[PDB]
Amino acid sequence: IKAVFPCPSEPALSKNELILTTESIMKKSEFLCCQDSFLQEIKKFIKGVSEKIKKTRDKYGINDNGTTEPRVLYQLDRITPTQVEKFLETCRDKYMRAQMEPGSAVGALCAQSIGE
């Protein structure tokens, strides 16, 4: 997601904002259908991304408000709001499409899979 849609001219805010944006997107009508365990796993991954951003920002001049002078420093762990919206949708669609289709002949597939 970061490479396919690298967003220049975007806020690139992080830490508290990342977790706030994620929780708002998770609770938007969709994602209720998603199994609850999956939603928790996304939150654990997002919490990890937020922790990584904080450590890097502390190590190399924390953004006072997004105004630090070497602007290359902002590229160190860059997640922008459009990327967060794309990541959460791609994960919902990938999960929904991974569900076994009803009528899958589940038993026949297992017997062949054990034999090979």
Partner 1 sequence: MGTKANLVTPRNGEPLIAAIQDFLTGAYLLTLKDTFFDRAKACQIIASILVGKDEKIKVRLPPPTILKPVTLWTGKQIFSVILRPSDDNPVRANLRTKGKQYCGKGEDLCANDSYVTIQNSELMSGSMDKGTLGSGSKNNIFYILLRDWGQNEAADAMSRLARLAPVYLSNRG
Partner 2 sequence: AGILFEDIFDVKDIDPEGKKFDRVSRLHCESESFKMDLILDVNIQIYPVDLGDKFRLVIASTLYEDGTLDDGEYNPTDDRPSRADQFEYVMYGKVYRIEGDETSTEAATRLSAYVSYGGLLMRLQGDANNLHGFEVDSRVYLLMKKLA
Residue type at 55 in one-letter notation: K
* Contacts with 94 (C-beta within 8 Å, 6 or more apart), sequence order: none
Binding partner selected for residue 37 from partner 1, partner 2, none, CB under the kind-specific 5 to 8 Å limit: none
Determine, following the binding rule CB under 8 A, whether residue 75 of this chain makes contact with partner 2. Answer: yes
Nearer to partner 2, 28 or 71 (CB): 71
Q: Which of 59, 65, 101, 112 binds partner 2 (CB under 8 A)?
A: 59
CA angle centred on 79, ends 50 and 92, rounded to 5°: 85
The CA-based angle 77-82-86, given to 5 degrees, is 100
Binding site for partner 1 (CB under 8 A): 3-4, 109, 112-113, 116
List alpha helices for the chain, DSSP H: 16-26, 36-59, 81-97, 106-115
71 is a site residue for partner 2 (CB under 8 A): yes
User: Residue 72 or 111: which CB sits closer to partner 2?
Assistant: 72
Positions touching partner 2 (CB under 8 A) are 3, 6, 8, 56, 58-60, 70-73, 75-76
